[PDB]
Structure formats: structure tokens, C-alpha cells
């Protein structure tokens, strides 16, 4: 919704080669990202988007907060998929991006795609869940990596981040079978999100 | 990407430019300033003329998490040619006090820019040493004969000066 | 479609490989084609000698080329066709898959937008060189190896997989010539860089351990004896009758013991005739080792010939010849006095490090540190008035 800066975490993994979403999950993310950018822009023109990845041996800033849709897209061609995502750093890298923005009038928000069973420790990320809300960052976990037969670390994180605050975390679970990733996010709330001051 | 490397000659301007840049970002007190480093490369002695600051954030609990504005650099290079059209990207300076093991990950990102293997020029900001208060390293990837896999590791290059007539006087 | 082929191949296969067959079927259905790839790796590691392998890979390569991990896919085949015994067949099959890849990267490289397929072309190209080497065509292999060599060096970061395949061509090629010193250096590079997932077997690894040891015993500028003892392949392979006497010969050399060397070689020279047709290197090596060793560990860089006579247990005629030969080899450098009966050295060839040797050099620095330190104090006390 309005009055928001957005860090999109795109998951670069080899679990994004699963053709559970046609054709492949990575290429489904290519369409999805472009929409999410446009949607936030027409709601309120102070919304800008930055892009980070999981890619590398350590995640990386590919795009700083920018008003250009084409730089986000360009960032997607740049990043490789042999890389692999680790949650613990990806959360922290994103907060650093939220400290350098084009519009310091907006508020701080993360949207995170997960295509991977995250083998990172649950207990570790629970400390980081409590870091975000002190920095006044919310994270939305778009989850379809851990419905692949792993336990849900995510349930715990979403509850911990939630606190009376206008930035509110939201949990989406998406059906793994074919419906076209971009469609499932588009038809579900991405601008009907509401605050909890 | 050239492996053409033997030495590093350093303009006095670089050392000084990087000393102020560290304190004007105000990433100091065990927080690093990392900027781009500009000069000639693709020759045995790497000739370093100039440096600029880059916006940078250093998580001090985890030096393995940082902020680097990738876009900006492309913007900056266009301005570097105005100054001198032999300035091109050749690396990034570190502000000491010495080499670290968080430097390899930062080095990665700097491979999308340089036509030479990214230089790490440690500008000591305290002025320690028995020669020039600089060390120089470059990242080279090489097999190890001990029995372990291919690592990327920093080999030292000597530090030296040479200077233009205008600069020296 | 492919499902019926899996079930008939599952039936024929081993009990060990039956549970791995079930998993390809389940994962195909569930559309999680990445965990599909991991099961295949474990299958291809221990399917080296069963016939099921060629058919299984032929099924999957057709359907997925970039919807599984490309590097592994090619690596399987290289191993598939080394274990084959029909080489005119292997050569076709590789060539046909190469053709497909060159067509493939026109559509798919841009469609995916972050996956190249050109690393796969190089991976096939390495094996076609080795195929010529199995047929005893050394020239053709070299023409493919020169192309691989240029590409590899341009890269400033290397995949382990490609440079492993690069070294594999070289090592088989040098030993057809029977070049010990060339073969040895190559094989060190190959073991060091090895992949996390080995399609390289322990049988080949035990062979490589044997070849290296022949090269060292039969070498003349190889003083890497402790390097073998400081690399897992030879120091952990001590386990068979064949590698017990052999391991001892490499230890005998390092300490410089001549009586044990002789006792083992008397047993073994009969049993294996390869030692019986290169004996000259073999018995001379232990004399050279002791010769380079002595000069290095002493502060002085000159030895009497009487000191050489004792230590290598040779006549005074051959003590002089041993020095000549060493310098020709370029292990020691200097000048020879026959008329002060000295050898005066100016160069030692770098050789092994060992706990022992580490300490020997340390001491020399303390002693030289004392010479520096006390002098600077003489000079400080002198000309005190003038330090401006």
C-alpha cells in the first residue's frame, strides 16, 4: 500500500529450476516483479523500488532505490542462478538498503520471495525478527519454498515481527501447483494491505 | 580482465584523497569507508591517479553485510573522463588498518566494472609502517598444492610512488 | 512415456539401486526437478560397472537441458564413456550431444536470462580429447587441448569441474611417453583441485598413487617426497601389500638410509620388472637426495669429498661424478675444486618443508639477529652528538 519503500528480495537458488510453476519459478518471478513495481507506483508516486538478490556467496545489492522500472529489470538479467540464498544475511542487507533511499518520506518494507527450503537455523532468525521491528522494518514472507516438505520456521518469524506499528508483516502461502505465480500474487492483496498503528 | 600485475605506484593525491573521504562520509570508529579507485590498469605497474568515495554502510557486528550503490558508480565514471580520459575503474580502496577476510566478498561485486582484477589498495589512515604507509593486494584465484581446492586469495604487490611534474613540485 | 522405461530399468537394476530408481519417478511427477538431480548424482557415482547407466542418462538428457543443473549432466557422460569398451561408439555419442548444445543456446540462453550452456560445450570437449588418447591418437587430442587451454586461462575465476577435466587429459598424455618428471607435476594439480562430487573413483585414485610413486623413485629433480606424505592420497593409502613396501621406499629416501633401500629393492626388483629397467635413476636418487640435503642444513656451503664419500657410501671416483651429475640436473650450482677437494655451492633447488626443516632455518635467523642487534648499539653509542 501507500507511503512505502520496497526492497524486493529475489531468491536465486537452484530450487527455482523446479517447473512446479510454468515454465520455471525464476522466469515466473521475472513477470511478477515488473507488476509489483507498477502497482506500487500508481497507488502513490513516492513509492520506489530497490532490488536485492540472494545471489553470490553472500547476497548483493543489484539496484538501489530508483524510479526506473528498467533498472530493476536490468538487475534481473545481471544476476545468476547458480548462486544460493541465505536468509540471515538477506534480511540485514535489505535493512541497509532501506537507509539509502530516493524518498526519505516513505516507510520501510521488505517483500521476500522464498523458493527454497531454508536450511538456516530457526533460532538464529528469531533474533533478527526482533531486530527488524526496532529498526521499524516489516517483512512480508511470500512463502512457497517450505511447502515442499520442510518444517515451517516462518510461522514463528511472522508473529515475532508483528507489533503495533503501521509497517505490518503479512504471511502468504501459495499453492505449489500450476496457476502462474504472478497471477496468485496479483489477485491477492498487494495494495489492500492495511496498517496496525 | 587482465592478470597484468607486478607493482603499484601511487600518486600522493590518492593517499590524501582517501584520508579525507573516510572522515567526510563519517563511517569511522571501526566502521569502514570503501570507495572506488581510479587510474590506469592493463600494465604491469598499476598506476593509481585518483579515488572517489562511494556511499557505503558497514554493519559492524557483521562485516559480511554491507551497502554498495552499484548504480552510482556508472554515474561517477562519466565524470571521471571529464577530469582525465585515462581514468577508468581499477579497483576500490580499503581504509585499513589492514587486510580482512570480509574483503573477498566485497571484491566480488567489483568485477562488473574493472577490466583488470580489482585492486585492493590499503590506505592506512593512521600512517603505520617503515616505508610508505600503504600495502597493496590483488585477488588472484589459484590452485593450492597442499591438497585443497581452488581458493581466491590476496597476493601482495609492492607499494611505490611515481608522480607527475605538477604533483611532485 | 518415460515412466514405463523407469519401471523396466528399475526391475533389472541392483537392490542397492532400487530405492534410487523410485525417486526419479516420484520427483518427475512432483515437478521438483532439482532434488531429482541430486538422486541421479548418487546413482551415477556407483553405477560405473552396471549397464543401466547409459540408458538412464539417454532418457533424461533429451527432456531437460536447463531445467536441471547443466554441469553435472555433462560430467556423468564423461565417466559413462570412459568405462565403455567400444570407443567408436563413444566418439559419435559425444559429438551428437555437442551438436545439440550449439543449437540449444540460441533459444534457451536468452529465454532463461541467467543460464549459459557454453560451459557444457567445454565439458564435452575435454572428453573427446581423452577419447583420442585412449585410441592412441596423441596429435588430435593436442589440437582440442590447445583450444581448452586458451579459454581456461582467460577466465579469472575457474569452475573446479573444467580445470579438473583439463588436467585429466594431460596426465594420461605424458606417461605414454614415459616422462616421469612431466607426469608428476600434472597429477599434483589434478588431485588438489578435485570436485566436491567426485565422478573420479577411488580405483583411479589408487592407480594415480602408484604412478606418482614410480615417477618419484625414478625421477631426478623431484624432491617432493614429503609432499606425497603431506597430501592425503599417499599417506592414507598404506592399506595393501603393494603399498606397504612402496611407502617405506619413500620414507627411506627422506631420512637418507641406504641399507633399507637396498634390502627392499632386492626383493622387489624381480617381482616387478619395471624397477629392473630404470635402476640407474633409482639407486642414484638416494645419493642425490643426501647430497642436496647436507649442503642446505650446514651453515657452510662447501663439503669435503671425504664427507660425501662416507655419506653416500661411494668410491672417490663416483663421488666426483655425483657432483657433476647433480649440477647438470640443476639441483646444486657452483664450482668444483678437485684440488682443494671441495664442492662450493651457490644455489640449492627449493625442496620439501617439514617440521624438522622448519626449525633448522629458524635457528640461523636468531644467530644472525644477534649480529645485527648488538652492532646498531655500537653505532648508537658512537657519534652521539650527531643524529640531526
Stated as kind and residue range, the H or E segment containing B9 is: strand B7-10
List Cα–Cα distances, B23 to B18, B26, B34, in angstroms: 9, 5, 12
Query: What is the distance between the terminal CA atoms of chain B, rounded to a whole angstrom?
Result: 35
Angle of helix C258-271 versus helix C279-297 axis, rounded to 10: 160
Contacts of A37 (CB under 8 A, 6+ apart): A49, A69, A72
Stated as kind and residue range, the H or E segment containing B115 is: none
Contacts of C83 (CB under 8 A, 6+ apart): C48, C49
CB-CB neighbors (< 8 A) of B144 in chain C = 192
Cβ atoms of residues A72 and A61 within 8 Å? no
Cβ atoms of residues B120 and B108 within 8 Å? no
Q: How far apart are CA C340 and CA C325, in angstroms?
A: 20
Torsion angle of C-alpha atoms C131, C132, C136, C141, degrees rounded to 10 = -130
Residue with cell 505465480: A181
According to DSSP, the residues that pair with B143 across neighbouring strands are none
Q: What are the φ/ψ torsions at residue B143 (nearest 5 degrees)?
A: -65, 155
Provide the phi-psi class of B39: left if phi over 0, else alpha when psi is between -120 and 50, else beta: left
Provide the phi-psi class of C136: left if phi over 0, else alpha when psi is between -120 and 50, else beta: left
Instruction: Output the nine-digit C-alpha cell for B120.
Output: 585492493
Q: How far apart are CA C44 and CA C80, in angstroms?
A: 9
Stated as kind and residue range, the H or E segment containing C346 is: strand C342-348
A87 touches chain B (CB under 8 A): no
| Strand A108-114 relative to strand A5-10, pairing | parallel
Cβ contact, residue pair A100, B67, below 8 Å: yes
* Helix ranges restricted to H, chain C: 2-12, 18-30, 33-45, 52-63, 70-83, 87-112, 118-135, 138-154, 160-176, 180-192, 202-217, 225-229, 232-236, 242-255, 258-271, 279-297, 305-312, 316-329, 355-381
How many domains does the structure of chain B reveal?
1
According to DSSP, the residues that pair with B10 across neighbouring strands are B48
Q: Of C212, C238, C210, which is closest to residue C224 (Cα–Cα)?
A: C212
Alpha-carbon torsion (A157, A161, A163, A169), positive or negative: negative
| Closest Cα in chain B to C155 | B1
Q: Of A150, A159, A153, A97, which is closest to residue A124 (Cα–Cα)?
A: A153
Provide Rg for chain C, Cα atoms: 29
Query: Which B positions 128-167 lie with beta carbon below 8 A of chain C?
Result: 141, 143-150, 152
B26 touches chain C (CB under 8 A): no
Cβ atoms of residues C142 and C107 within 8 Å? no
Residue with cell 548418487: C42
Q: How far apart are CA C179 and CA C173, in angstroms?
A: 9
Q: Of A5, A8, A14, A20, which is closest to residue A179 (Cα–Cα)?
A: A20
Contacts of C37 (CB under 8 A, 6+ apart): C68, C69, C72
Show the CA angle centred on residue A84, arms to residues A81 and A86, nearest 5°. 145
Contacts of C171 (CB under 8 A, 6+ apart): C183, C186, C187, C190, C208
CA distance B147 to chain C (A): 4
Q: Of A88, A87, A141, A82, which is closest to residue A110 (Cα–Cα)?
A: A141
Provide Rg for chain B, Cα atoms: 16
CB pairs under 8 A between B and C: 37
Stated as kind and residue range, the H or E segment containing B99 is: none
Instruction: Output the nine-digit C-alpha cell for C260.
Output: 633399507
Reduced to 3 states (helix: H, G, I; strand: E, B; else coil), residue B24 is: helix
Domain that holds residue B24: 3-169
The DSSP code sequence of A75-131 is: HHHHS-SSS---HHHHHHHHHHHTTS-S-TTS-EEEEEEE-S---S-HHHHHHHHHH
Omega of the bond leading into C101 within 30 degrees of 0 (cis): no
Contacts of A180 (CB under 8 A, 6+ apart): A21, A22, A28
* Class of residue C41 by CB neighbours under 10 A (exposed 0-12, middle 13-18, buried 19+): middle
Provide the greatest CA pair distance for chain B: 52
| Strand C342-348 relative to strand C302-304, pairing | antiparallel
Instruction: Output the nine-digit C-alpha cell for A121.
Output: 537455523
Q: How far apart are CA A24 and CA C65, in angstroms?
A: 13
Cβ atoms of residues C158 and B153 within 8 Å? no
The DSSP code sequence of A34-53 is: HHHHHHHHHH-TT--EEEEE
| Closest Cα in chain A to B102 | A58
Residue with cell 577508468: B88
Cβ atoms of residues B53 and B25 within 8 Å? yes
Alpha-carbon torsion (B75, B76, B78, B82), positive or negative: positive
Could you say which DSSP state residue C352 is in?
Answer: -
Instruction: Output the nine-digit C-alpha cell for C9.
Output: 530399468
Q: Of B93, B95, B92, which is closest to residue B28 (Cα–Cα)?
A: B95
Q: Of C39, C13, C44, C41, which is closest to residue C25 (Cα–Cα)?
A: C39
Cβ atoms of residues B139 and B154 within 8 Å? yes
Query: Which A positions 29-48 lie with beta carbon below 8 A of chain B?
Result: none
Stated as kind and residue range, the H or E segment containing C333 is: strand C332-337
Instruction: Output the nine-digit C-alpha cell for A117.
Output: 527450503
CA distance C225 to chain B (A): 13
Q: How far apart are CA C24 and CA C33, in angstroms?
A: 9
Cβ atoms of residues A164 and A194 within 8 Å? no
Q: How far apart are CA C67 and CA C37, in angstroms?
A: 10
Cβ atoms of residues A54 and A12 within 8 Å? yes
Half-sphere CA count of A174, side-chain side, radius 13 A = 26
Residue C204, number of CB atoms within 10 A of its CB: 12
The domain that holds B103 is classified in CATH as 3.40.140.10
* Class of residue B83 by CB neighbours under 10 A (exposed 0-12, middle 13-18, buried 19+): exposed
Residue with cell 589498495: B121
Q: How far apart are CA A105 and CA C142, in angstroms?
A: 65
Q: Please report all neighbours of B, defined by 3+ CB atom pairs within 8 A.
A: A, C
* Class of residue C45 by CB neighbours under 10 A (exposed 0-12, middle 13-18, buried 19+): middle
Q: How far apart are CA A71 and CA B75, in angstroms?
A: 13
Chain A residues at the C interface, defined by Cβ less than 8 Å, are 12, 14-15, 17-20, 24, 26-27, 30, 76-77, 79-81, 148
According to DSSP, the residues that pair with A143 across neighbouring strands are A114, A173
According to DSSP, the residues that pair with B7 across neighbouring strands are B45
What b-and-e string marks burial along A150-181, b requiring 16 or more CB atoms within 10 Å of the CB?
A: eeebbeebbebbbbebebbbbbeebebeeeeb
Could you say which DSSP state residue B117 is in?
Answer: P
Residue with cell 583488470: B116
Instruction: Output the nine-digit C-alpha cell for C107.
Output: 533459444
Residue with cell 573477498: B104
Reduced to 3 states (helix: H, G, I; strand: E, B; else coil), residue C61 is: helix
Torsion angle of C-alpha atoms C66, C67, C68, C70, degrees rounded to 10 = 0
Query: What is the distance between the terminal CA atoms of chain C, rounded to a whole angstrom?
Result: 93
C31 touches chain A (CB under 8 A): yes
Cβ atoms of residues B35 and B21 within 8 Å? yes
Q: How was this structure determined?
A: cryo-EM
Cβ contact, residue pair B69, A61, below 8 Å: yes
Amino acid at each position: 500500500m501507500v507511503l512505502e519503500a520496497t526492497v524486493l528480495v529475489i531468491d536465486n537458488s537452484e530450487y527455482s529450476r523446479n517447473g512446479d510453476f510454468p515454465r520455471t519459478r525464476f522466469e515466473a518471478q521475472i513477470d511478477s516483479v515488473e507488476f509489483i513495481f507498477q502497482a506500487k507506483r500508481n497507488s502513490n508516486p513516492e513509492n520506489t523500488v530497490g532490488l536485492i538478490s540472494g545471489a553470490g556467496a553472500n547476497p548483493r545489492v543489484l539496484s538501489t532505490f530508483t524510479a526506473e522500472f528498467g533498472k530493476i529489470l536490468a538487475g534481473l538479467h545481471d544476476t545468476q542462478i547458480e548462486g544460493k540464498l541465505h536468509m540471515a544475511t538477506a534480511l540485514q542487507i535489505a535493512q541497509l538498503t532501506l537507509k539509502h533511499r530516493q524518498n526519505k518520506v516513505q516507510h520501510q518494507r521488505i517483500v521476500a520471495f522464498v523458493c527454497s527450503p531454508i536450511s538456516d537455523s530457526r533460532d538464529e532468525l528469531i533474533r533478527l525478527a526482533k531486530t527488524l521491528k526496532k529498526n521499524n522494518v516489516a517483512v512480508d514472507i511470500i512463502n512457497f519454498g517450505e511447502i515442499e516438505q520442510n518444517t515451517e520456521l516462518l510461522d514463528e518469524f511472522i508473529a515475532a515481527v508483528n507489533n503495533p506499528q503501521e509497517e505490518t508483516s503479512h504471511l502468504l502461502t501459495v499453492t505449489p501447483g500450476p496457476r502462474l505465480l504472478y497471477e496468485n500474487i496479483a489477485s491477492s492483496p498487494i495494495i489492500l494491505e492495511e496498517g496496525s498503528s | 580482465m587482465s592478470l597484468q600485475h607486478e607493482k603499484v605506484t601511487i600518486a600522493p593525491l590518492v593517499l590524501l584523497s582517501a584520508l579525507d573521504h573516510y572522515e567526510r562520509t563519517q563511517t569511522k570508529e571501526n566502521k569502514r569507508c570503501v570507495g572506488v579507485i581510479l587510474g590506469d590498469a592493463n600494465s604491469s605497474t598499476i598506476r593509481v591517479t585518483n579515488s572517489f568515495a562511494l556511499p557505503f554502510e558497514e554493519d559492524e557486528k557483521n562485516s559480511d553485510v554491507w551497502f554498495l550503490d552499484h548504480n552510482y558508480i556508472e554515474n561517477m565514471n562519466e565524470m571521471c573522463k571529464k577530469i582525465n580520459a585515462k581514468e577508468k575503474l581499477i579497483g576500490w580502496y580499503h581504509s585499513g588498518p589492514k587486510l580482512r577476510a570480509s574483503d573477498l566478498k566485497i571484491n566480488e561485486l567489483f568485477k562488473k566494472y574493472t577490466q583488470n582484477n580489482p585492486l585492493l589498495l590499503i590506505v592506512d589512515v593512521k600512517q603505520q609502517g617503515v616505508g610508505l604507509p600503504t600495502d597493496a593486494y590483488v585477488a588472484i584465484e589459484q590452485v593450492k598444492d597442499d591438497g585443497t581446492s581452488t581458493e581466491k586469495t590476496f597476493l601482495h604487490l609492492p607499494c611505490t610512488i611515481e608522480a607527475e611534474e605538477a604533483e611532485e613540485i | 512415456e518415460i515412466d514405463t522405461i523407469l519401471s523396466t530399468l528399475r526391475m533389472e537394476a541392483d537392490p542397492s539401486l532400487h530405492p534410487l530408481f523410485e525417486q526419479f519417478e516420484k520427483f518427475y511427477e512432483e515437478k521438483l526437478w532439482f532434488q531429482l538431480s541430486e538422486s541421479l548424482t548418487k546413482f551415477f557415482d556407483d553405477a560405473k560397472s552396471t549397464p543401466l547407466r547409459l540408458r538412464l542418462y539417454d532418457n533424461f538428457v533429451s527432456k531437460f537441458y536447463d531445467k536441471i543443473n547443466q554441469l553435472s549432466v555433462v560430467k556423468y557422460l564423461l565417466a559413462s564413456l570412459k568405462d565403455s569398451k567400444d570407443f567408436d561408439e563413444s566418439l559419435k555419442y559425444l559429438d551428437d550431444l555437442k551438436a545439440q548444445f550449439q543449437e540449444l543456446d540460441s533459444k534457451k540462453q536468452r529465454n532463461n536470462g541467467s543460464k549459459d550452456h557454453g560451459d557444457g560445450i567445454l565439458l564435452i570437449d575435454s572428453e573427446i580429447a581423452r577419447t583420442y588418447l585412449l585410441k592412441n591418437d596423441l596429435v588430435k587430442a593436442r589440437d582440442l587441448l590447445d583450444d581448452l587451454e586458451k579459454t581456461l586461462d582467460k577466465k579469472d575465476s575457474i569452475p573446479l569441474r573444467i580445470t579438473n577435466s583439463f588436467y585429466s587429459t594431460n596426465s594420461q598424455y605424458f606417461k605414454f611417453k614415459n616422462d616421469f618428471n612431466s607426469f608428476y607435476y600434472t597429477s599434483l594439480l589434478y588431485l588438489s583441485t578435485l570436485e566436491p562430487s567426485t565422478s573420479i573413483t577411488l580405483a583411479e585414485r589408487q592407480q594415480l598413487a602408484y604412478d606418482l610413486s614410480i615417477s618419484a623413485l625414478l625421477g631426478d629433480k623431484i624432491y617432493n617426497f614429503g609432499e606425497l606424505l603431506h597430501h592425503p592420497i599417499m599417506e592414507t593409502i598404506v592399506n595393501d601389500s603393494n603399498y606397504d613396501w612402496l611407502f617405506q621406499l619413500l620414507n627411506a629416501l627422506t631420512v637418507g638410509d641406504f641399507d633399507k633401500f637396498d634390502s627392499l629393492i632386492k626383493v622387489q626388483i624381480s617381482k616387478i620388472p619395471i624397477l629392473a629397467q630404470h635402476e640407474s635413476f633409482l639407486r642414484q636418487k638416494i645419493c642425490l637426495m643426501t647430497l642436496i640435503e647436507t649442503v642446505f642444513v650446514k651453515n657452510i656451503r662447501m663439503l669435503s669429498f671425504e664427507d660425501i664419500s662416507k655419506a653416500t657410501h661411494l668410491p672417490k671416483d663416483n663421488v666426483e661424478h655425483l657432483v657433476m651429475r647433480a649440477i647438470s640436473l640443476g639441483l646444486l650450482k657452483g664450482s668444483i675444486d678437485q684440488v682443494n677437494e671441495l664442492v662450493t655451492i651457490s644455489w640449492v633447488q627449493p625442496r620439501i618443508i617439514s617440521g624438522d626443516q622448519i626449525t633448522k632455518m629458524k635457528d640461523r635467523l636468531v644467530e644472525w639477529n644477534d649480529q645485527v642487534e648488538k652492532l646498531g648499539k655500537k653505532m648508537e653509542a658512537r657519534g652521539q652528538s650527531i643524529w640531526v
